[PDB]
Amino acid sequence: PIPDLKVFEREGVQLNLSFIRPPENPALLLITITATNFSEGDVTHFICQAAVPKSLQLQLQAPSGNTVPARGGLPITQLFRILNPNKAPLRLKLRLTYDHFHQSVQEIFEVNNLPVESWQ
């Protein structure tokens, strides 16, 4: 089992990666992103876009929603299906956009510290 990885925090809003490598399909990696909000203000219009090396292939599922309510409200989850049969090193760049405290938030960053286990 591969442990989660916190990849982003800003003013109570956090993003977290979970990983699953199903044994019955070695080529496949399932990444679930989870957005939580422990601030005093709702997060709205939450969108997460992702990019990966051309050496592998990615398909996104629609997220569970676009709103993360204040004070430990229900999270947003989004699944990313990754096929990496050639076992190339995974790299992951995310673009986050959302509204929080009536301000437009825009953040972009590559995820460091991705476990080798997620692509090996």
UniProtKB/Swiss-Prot annotation:
Subcellular location: Golgi apparatus membrane; Cytoplasmic vesicle membrane; Endosome membrane
Residue ranges occupied by any GAE domain in the UniProt entry: 1-115
Tissue distribution of the protein: Expressed in all but one (skeletal muscle) tissues examined.
Biological function: May function in protein sorting in late endosomes or multivesucular bodies (MVBs).
Oligomer status and interactors: May interact with AP1S1/Sigma1A-adaptin and AP1S2/Sigma1B-adaptin. Probably does not interact with APB1. Interacts (via GAE domain) with RABEP1, NECAP1, CLINT1 and AFTPH/aftiphilin. (Microbial infection) Interacts with HBV major surface antigen L. Interacts with HBV core protein C in a ubiquitin-dependent manner.
Protein family membership: Belongs to the adaptor complexes large subunit family.
Protein name: AP-1 complex subunit gamma-like 2
Lineage: Eukaryota, Metazoa, Chordata, Craniata, Vertebrata
Encoding gene, per UniProt annotation: AP1G2
